[PDB]
Design a protein around this ligand. Structure first.
Ligand code: ADP
Ligand code: ADP
Ligand code: ADP
Lengths: 512, 521, 523, 106
């Protein structure tokens, strides 16, 4: 029914801790697999933290919050999501100070929020900039995802695709340097070819099919037209259908259907275009004028998809076709091609311009290999987004965790009060990240984690992390495990903000 | 630590659940390894019985109760799709790999350390396979040893010489000048009313539907093959008309006019028959897929034509590439350029049905292997053995290298791994030792099924050492060592190659399983 | 929850572990199948109180009839049943041989597996002993059929086949079956058991039966025509009555005037339809259903010989013999669907009028044994004994070779196989020696069913056979456990009967031994 | 592990008897016949006493146990343990253990 008292906070901890214990071993390159018993007796042997929790049923609402916060991470950053839940579960797993010591959550939350400002400052100290102009460094950075994948045979290809693609979308002139991979980097697959044939189209590719053969097959100077209205007979304000029974009234309603569709098409062809792109559908009578005009018929193109076209070829959006002025012409466009590349038509309006958007062409030998190349390239685009938004990397392999933990432990010495105890407990929670990397490799956890903390005390904290493959210690200057800063800061805030959230819950109430 | 309506195995006992399933599946399939191995029955529940030793059939068609064991069954499907052999030996090595790993995992060893040893033992075992393979030329004497080695594992040691010569000759007819090979060129037919040993080859092709008229020729020693797809039965009016009648007889009178479009096209058939060698000591055959009217059949039958009707898409496909007759979709464009040619064309009468045979062709690029048996399941068992025998001869021809059998490669690779110090990690050799002992399960099981001691057989073949290339195997009749290359036992290079790639990947992934969770089960 | 089930992993199929000896369970199912049919062996076979699927009570001692009604479900036992179905092809006897002998091999194989012999060593030994048996069996051929087509010769050989299926009537049936079989042997290479169609009539007893040519049918001619040689024959399963079209044809009868008119309309329809039969020249028609009284007048009007055969299988014989097919409508005048026959006429035999379809001008090979009996149960059992007798000589159209009976061959063949087993070294001697003891199960059953001590009979046979006194079998007698010469007594089997039975029984047992685990599967 | 594979137990015992005879010969090759002195016996007594104490009475008991045998070991006589009597005393700590040149009476 409901929960109240200390049972709530201790219950939310066991729920969040239980969800993290599932994916404790799903961290690093030597991640362990998980067996998911389907209801029909089947098994899925995935090792992805997002896919595991997505398929698991959870009864506690605290678990739904942990999972729903992880999904929000995937939309922004396709990496480090597993670290959020583990840290959020370890930060909450310290229930000694929470209940056994009878401290109020406001005392704990004030310490967790104080450490978060210190964890953020320490990560910027151990950071390091990157020369984004040199693509060789970004290759080593993007290899964190290409490693242990089938696309390693064309690893450099994936970097040049993702690197150059995000640079086109990056509109730095607006100050904030916003990037939109979902809209301005729309990806579409093309059957045929191989992995090497994968490239980036410098334009906008529409997957519209060819309905008739009377369409422009190859053009050197396209002329694209844009409009939102539909090419059909003007209906009434309501959706009332036209019901007719008298034959004499048919020719009247038919003539009204033909003339208005006729006059609207006559104005579209006055500019001598090569393709009519409309947002809404195009009826059969309207297509009879497009095939007669020897121009391509295109429809069902969204607003943002049309906005990129006007920036590419120089077209102009109009409400209706009747108001089409001479400005709506795609002069300077590269070419218009509706070739059937791999048993599927593809509209290419590429040009020699970068209209703050592009389209990625995924060539491949089969749908299985195409999907493998697809999901592997999206993460590379996001790593390029995170580095280009904030070109600062921090040492990975558990080094940034141990480096930050030493700063809090040394800073807690001057922390007079009861908040020093949970403030230090957050530092010991960061050690769980190398604790799992060492557990997966099989090396002794206590022996290496003890020596690992000693290296950060004496030697510089910017290096001396952990090697997940070998298990021994290694400097991140010698091993390119450097991860972005924006991923770690958002990973650290989301873990503390999530733990602060569940700690603020004291009564699970039902009602609507 | 779990939500309601679910379950979770947190500790390492989840791994023991997967090890127990593989150990159980090992003990099931080990009794059907090799020729002397037993057979397993597949009761479909409806009442159909089926006996077979093919591990792919005992895992794909047989549904497995345990959830974990069904995963390994899907791999046997994947193993059969690449090489078509080794599915049984794949499961036995997986069962022993996980068995040997549990001995060290119980001592506190992590699974990830053992899997890194398998990756090292695989590369060493893969390099040693390159040295043992024999790249000799493939001759009829060699492929017979391959076909016998592949067919004796699926039959009662009586259909060996029967299906061996058929399986070998079927392949040699479809490869010359280093051309790429395709097993789809060989058709597999099944017929009853004869003993199991009545299997033989068919150089031509078998057709289902035969001629239907008393005046037909039972055999045509020569004829031009005319491919067609036009319905010579009663069809609708082909012109813009309808049914303008006043009674039933007037409706029937218009059907005569509707038959004018078909009846005249029958004369066009008779015309080209009389034109293209319609003289004495000659014949003509029509293979029209669609139906033919009884009255129209009377016209062609009296002219000495052996007509056929209501054929399948597969028959017309092979009939075209074999005979060369191009399909005419309308008799208006009838011409002699679309005509083929063939030798003997006859219909062998069985006790119940009949089938048309088009044997004695020059180079049809397609043949047929006619299987004969008394029962239904026996024909299916022989169909599987031929497909496994053809794919075995295919691999030996495509991949010109072959390797010895009878566990001689497994015994040699195991000795090489033991004679291999660590190179990736100190503790990795524990997995290399487990990989070595896992390979020895193959000669161990061959000694069990043959009825000999498991330990005496393996120790004798291991003691064979000399200052020269020496590869001994398990003699199923004697039990003593036996040079598999001398007696004529040869396995493919892709079979042993894919075993190491398939065994290591699955034995690795099953070891990396830390927890077993219910996804709403 | 641990501990798990031993070997049970495939659709819950019970996988008996090594201690449970999964092979032994299949042997027990095949062992139990023999015990049901072991008692039905020989002339002293015990009858079975069989209950048909239609809740009908039939008493018989035929082995094939038992397995048909006994729904065998264990697939290991189905292998022997499928061997018996194969034993029915190429020979019409030896069904109990395949059941009793295969069970003896499986019974003795379990004794070998308990010692520790492998399943493959037992299979290889049986396949070797089967080859030695096929080499020893021609040497046991003592006499053969003289090839004279004489009723005295044929009746002498059929006594052994008819015996063990119907005792007491050994003398009459041997002559009755002989008269029907000798009439076709002149057709060299064309003798068929299918040509001898058995028809049975309720009557006094078996002694009142006789033999006749052509396709005899008990139901007399409904018409008034005696004999006609019209080849145009047409079968109409639809009953002769007032014609109705497949269309609506709604007949509205309101007043007694319209009643008599449409009642007379039925007279015009039957007269018009029966007229169509004579227009084609088909003066012979066979009815599947009833016959209208007015049609009897029209049958005699146009002089059409009308016949009524109510049984469906009686019509199927005509559809497959002469070719006249059974159409669904009322007398379709289709000459294409008509048959051919050289002579057709009614005949009176045993105070019973029967229709006859014979071939006077053509060569002809058709015959019929008109059986008579007071009880349909006992009369139906006599039919099965006729098929075993006719099929015995269908085999003798092949190589005419006979061997002794009464278990004489089984001891002589076991004596010789045991010799090779002693010389042959290795582990094959165990399976070869037990293969010889599997032959002892036949006279052991033949002696047990006669009420005789089994071991006392086998000791006497091995003693006289050691003296070279071949042809010595079991003396069928309730009180006398002695033996006698089977050749002089006239008891002889067929060579191909023992050949195909020993071959299929060995393969049936080997196919069971090769199996070691039965698994269920879902499609 | 091997008996589950169908191996008889008696065969395994024959392997132990062969390895045992080879194992005994290996001791004769690696045994160090070092002359008995104070430093050698200290390492031996330390190796034995450390396995029965808290590593604090080892250095204390080592020199006492070594000198007890040397007090009775002379003239190449067989060492008799009846020559050393063990006496216990309360009212003191554990590390006060030391040797007595002569007897002690209650
Ligand atoms: N090659 C490597 N060597 C050492 N540590 C690594 C390596 N690759 C990744 N890691 C560590 O593993 C952690 C998880 O990486 P990743 O799998 O990319 O994210 P997630 O586990 O959230 O999916 C990171 O914090 C990183 O420090
Ligand atoms: N004379 C023969 N002698 C010894 N071993 C054989 C012989 N023929 C086949 N084998 C062994 O039987 C094993 C199984 O063969 P096969 O049935 O083709 O593969 P699978 O059992 O995996 O389907 C092989 O590993 C091979 O070594
Ligand atoms: N009157 C008889 N005297 C002695 N032996 C007989 C007699 N009748 C049959 N037998 C023996 O019984 C055996 C079985 O005969 P039968 O019943 O015709 O075959 P099955 O038992 O296979 O149906 C024959 O091998 C024959 O030797």
């Amino acid at each position: 029914k409901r929960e109240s008292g200390r049972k709530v906070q201790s219950g939310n901890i066991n729920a969040a801790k239980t969800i993290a214990d599932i994916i404790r071993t799903c961290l690093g390159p030597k991640s362990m697999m998980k067996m998911l018993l389907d209801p029909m007796g089947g098994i899925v042997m995935t090792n992805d933290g997002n896919a595991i929790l997505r398929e698991i049923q959870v009864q506690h609402p605290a678990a739904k919050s942990m999972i729903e916060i992880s999904r929000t991470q995937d939309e922004e950053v396709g990496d480090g999501t597993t670290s959020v839940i583990i840290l959020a579960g370890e930060m909450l797993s310290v229930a000694e100070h929470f209940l056994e010591q009878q401290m109020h959550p406001t005392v704990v939350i004030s310490a967790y929020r104080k450490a978060l400002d210190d964890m953020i400052s320490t990560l910027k100290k151990i950071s390091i900039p990157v020369d984004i102009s040199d693509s060789d460094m970004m290759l080593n950075i993007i290899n964190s995802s290409i490693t242990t994948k089938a696309i390693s045979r064309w690893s450099s290809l994936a970097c040049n695709i993702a690197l150059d693609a995000v640079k086109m979308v990056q509109f730095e002139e607006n100050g904030r340097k916003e990037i939109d991979i979902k809209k301005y980097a729309r990806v579409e697959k093309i059957p045929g070819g191989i992995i090497e044939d994968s490239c980036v189209l410098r334009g906008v590719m529409i997957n519209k099919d060819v309905t008739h053969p009377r369409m422009r097959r190859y053009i050197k100077n396209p002329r694209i037209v844009l409009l939102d209205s539909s090419l059909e007979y003007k209906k009434g304000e309501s959706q009332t259908d036209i019901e007719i029974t008298r034959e004499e009234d048919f020719t009247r309603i038919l003539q009204m259907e033909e003339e208005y569709i006729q006059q609207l098409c006559e104005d579209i062809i006055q500019l001598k275009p090569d393709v009519v792109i409309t947002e809404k559908g195009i009826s059969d009578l309207a297509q009879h004028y497009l095939m007669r005009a020897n121009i391509t018929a295109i429809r069902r193109v969204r607003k943002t998809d049309n906005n990129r076209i006007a920036r590419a070829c120089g077209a102009r959006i109009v409400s209706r076709p009747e108001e089409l002025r001479e400005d709506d012409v795609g002069t300077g466009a590269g070419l218009l091609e509706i070739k059937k590349i791999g048993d599927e038509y593809f509209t290419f309006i590429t040009d020699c311009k970068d209209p703050k958007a592009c389209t990625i062409l995924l060539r491949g030998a089969s749908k299985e290999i195409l999907s493998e190349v697809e999901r592997n390239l999206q993460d590379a685009m996001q790593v390029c987004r995170n580095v280009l938004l904030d070109p600062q990397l921090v040492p990975g392999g558990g080094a940034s965790e141990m480096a930050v933990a030493h700063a809090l432990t040394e800073k807690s010495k001057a922390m007079t009060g009861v908040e020093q105890w949970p403030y230090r407990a957050v530092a010991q929670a960061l050690e769980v990240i190398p604790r799992t990397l060492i557990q997966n490799c099989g090396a002794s956890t206590i022996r290496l984690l003890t020596s690992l903390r000693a290296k950060h005390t004496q030697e510089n904290c910017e290096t001396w992390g952990v090697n997940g493959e070998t298990g021994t210690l290694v400097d991140m200057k010698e091993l390119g495990i450097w991860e972005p800063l924006a991923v770690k800061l958002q990973t650290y805030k989301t873990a503390v903000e999530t733990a602060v959230l569940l700690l603020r819950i004291d009564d699970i109430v039902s009602g609507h | 630590t779990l939500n309601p309506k679910a379950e979770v195995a947190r500790a390492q006992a989840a791994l023991a659940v997967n090890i127990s399933a593989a150990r159980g599946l090992q003990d099931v399939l080990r009794t059907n390894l090799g020729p002397k191995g037993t057979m397993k029955m597949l009761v479909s529940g409806a009442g159909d019985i089926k006996l077979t030793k093919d591990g792919n059939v005992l895992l794909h068609e047989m549904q497995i109760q345990h959830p974990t064991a069904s995963l390994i069954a899907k791999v046997a499907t994947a193993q059969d799709d690449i090489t078509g052999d080794g599915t049984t030996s794949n499961v036995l090595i997986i069962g022993e790999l996980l068995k040997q790993a549990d001995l060290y995992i119980s001592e506190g060893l992590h699974p990830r350390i053992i899997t890194e040893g398998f990756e090292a033992a695989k590369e060493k075992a893969l390099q040693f396979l390159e040295e043992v393979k024999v790249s000799r030329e493939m001759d009829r004497e060699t492929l017979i040893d391959v076909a016998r080695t592949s067919l004796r594992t699926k039959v009662h040691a009586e259909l060996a010489d029967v299906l061996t010569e058929a399986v070998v000759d079927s392949i040699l007819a479809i490869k010359k000048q280093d051309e790429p090979i395709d097993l789809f060129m060989i058709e597999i037919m099944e017929m009853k009313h004869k003993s199991e040993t009545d299997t033989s080859l068919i150089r031509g092709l078998v057709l289902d539907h035969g001629a239907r008229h008393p005046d037909m020729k039972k055999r045509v020693e020569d004829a031009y093959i005319l491919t067609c797809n036009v319905s010579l039965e009663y069809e609708k009016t082909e012109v813009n008309s309808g049914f303008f009648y006043k009674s039933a007889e007037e409706r029937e009178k218009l059907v005569k006019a509707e038959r004018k479009f078909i009846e005249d096209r029958v004369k066009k058939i008779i015309e080209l028959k009389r034109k293209v060698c319609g003289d004495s000591d000659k014949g003509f055959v029509v293979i029209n897929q669609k139906g033919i009217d009884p009255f129209s059949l009377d016209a062609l039958s009296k002219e000495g034509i052996v007509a056929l009707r209501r054929a399948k898409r597969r028959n017309m496909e092979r009939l075209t590439l074999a005979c060369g007759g191009v399909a005419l979709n309308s008799f208006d464009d009838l011409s002699p350029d679309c005509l083929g040619h063939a030798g003997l064309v006859y219909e062998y009468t069985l006790g119940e049905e009949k089938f048309t045979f088009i044997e004695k062709c020059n180079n049809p690029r397609s043949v047929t292997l006619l299987i004969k048996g008394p029962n239904k399941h026996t024909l299916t068992q022989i169909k599987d053995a031929v497909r496994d025998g053809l794919r075995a001869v295919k691999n030996a021809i495509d991949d010109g290298c072959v390797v010895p059998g009878a566990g001689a490669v497994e015994v040699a690779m195991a000795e090489a791994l033991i004679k291999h110090k660590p190179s990736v990690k100190g503790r990795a050799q524990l997995g290399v030792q487990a990989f070595a002992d896992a390979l020895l399960i193959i000669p161990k099981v061959l000694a069990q099924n043959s009825g000999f001691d498991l330990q005496e057989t393996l120790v004798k073949i291991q003691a064979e050492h000399s200052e020269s290339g020496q590869l001994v195997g398990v003699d199923l009749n004697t039990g003593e060592p036996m040079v598999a290359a001398e007696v004529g036992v040869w396995d493919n290079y892709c079979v042993k190659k894919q075993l190491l790639h398939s065994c290591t990947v699955i034995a690795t992934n099953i070891l990396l399983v830390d927890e077993i969770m219910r996804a709403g089960m | 929850k641990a501990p798990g089930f031993a070997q049970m992993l495939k659709e819950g199929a019970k996988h008996f572990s090594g201690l449970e000896e999964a092979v032994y369970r299949n042997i027990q199912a095949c062992k139990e199948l023999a015990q049901t049919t072991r008692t039905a062996y020989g002339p002293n076979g015990m009858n079975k109180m069989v209950i048909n699927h239609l809740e009908k009570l039939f008493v018989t001692n035929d082995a094939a009839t038992i397995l048909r009604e006994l729904e065998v479900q264990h697939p290991a036992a189905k292998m022997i049943v499928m061997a018996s179905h194969m034993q029915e092809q190429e020979v019409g006897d030896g069904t109990n041989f395949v059941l009793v002998f295969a069970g003896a091999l499986l019974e003795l194989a379990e004794e070998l597996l308990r010692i520790g012999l492998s399943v493959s060593e037992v299979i290889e030994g049986y396949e070797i002993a089967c080859r030695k048996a096929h080499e020893i069996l021609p040497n046991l051929v003592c006499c053969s059929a003289k090839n004279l087509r004489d009723i005295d010769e044929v009746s002498s050989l059929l006594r052994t086949s008819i015996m063990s299926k119907q005792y007491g009537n050994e003398v009459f049936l041997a002559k009755l079956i002989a008269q029907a079989c000798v009439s076709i042997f002149p057709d060299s290479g064309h003798f068929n058991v299918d040509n001898i169609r058995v028809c049975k009539i309720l009557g006094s007893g078996i002694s009142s039966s006789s033999v006749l040519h052509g396709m005899v049918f008990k139901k007399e001619t409904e018409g008034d025509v005696t004999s006609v040689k019209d080849a145009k024959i047409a079968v109409y399963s639809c009953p002769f009555d007032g014609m109705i079209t497949e269309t609506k044809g709604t007949v509205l009868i309101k007043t007694a005037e319209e009643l008599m008119n449409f009642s007379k309309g039925e007279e015009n329809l039957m007269d018009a339809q029966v007229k169509a039969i004579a227009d084609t020249g088909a003066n012979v028609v066979v009815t599947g259903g009833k016959v209208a009284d007015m049609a009897l007048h029209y049958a005699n009007k146009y002089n059409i010989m009308l016949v009524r055969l109510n049984s469906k299988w009686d019509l199927r014989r005509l559809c497959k013999t002469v070719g006249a097919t059974a159409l669904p409508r009322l007398t379709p005048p289709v000459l294409e669907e008509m048959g051919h026959c050289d002579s057709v006429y009614l005949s009176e035999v045993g105070d019973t009028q029967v229709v006859v379809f014979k071939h006077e001008k053509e060569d002809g090979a058709i015959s019929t044994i008109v059986l008579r009996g007071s009880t349909d149960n006992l009369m139906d059992d006599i039919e099965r004994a006729v098929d075993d007798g006719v099929n015995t000589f269908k085999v003798l159209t092949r190589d005419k070779r006979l061997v002794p009976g009464g278990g004489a061959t089984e001891i002589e063949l076991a004596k010789q196989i045991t010799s090779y087993g002693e010389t042959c070294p290795g582990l094959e001697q165990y399976a070869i020696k037990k293969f010889a003891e599997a032959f002892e199960a036949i006279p052991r059953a033949l002696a047990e069913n006669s009420g005789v001590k089994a071991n006392e009979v086998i000791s006497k046979l091995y003693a006289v056979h050691q003296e070279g006194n071949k042809n010595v079998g079991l003396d069928i007698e309730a009180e006398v456990p002695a033996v006698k010469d089977m050749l002089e007594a006239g008891i002889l089997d067929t060579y191909l009967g023992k050949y195909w039975a020993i071959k299929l029984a060995t393969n049936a047992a080997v196919t069971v031994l090769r199996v070691d685990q039965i698994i269920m599967a879902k499609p």
